[PDB]
């Protein structure tokens, strides 16, 4: 399952999806290398969390994103409109 974050930017630049994912990784103390398959789709960025030394899961990433939304928005300079985990 992938995580996703929908922003107010469209199309979201690849470079910007990457920065936003890096911001989220920092909140969780995991290197950005733990996020794989990073891709932008319209206004959204999507990603997979691989197994890591911090034991951070896909749901932990979603929760940290909700809990720190305002900080992420300040750091990134964009708005987050939705976040979640996808379903096959």
Curated annotation (Swiss-Prot):
This is IA-2beta60. Glycans are attached at residue 55. It comes from the Eukaryota. It is found in: Cytoplasmic vesicle, Secretory vesicle membrane.
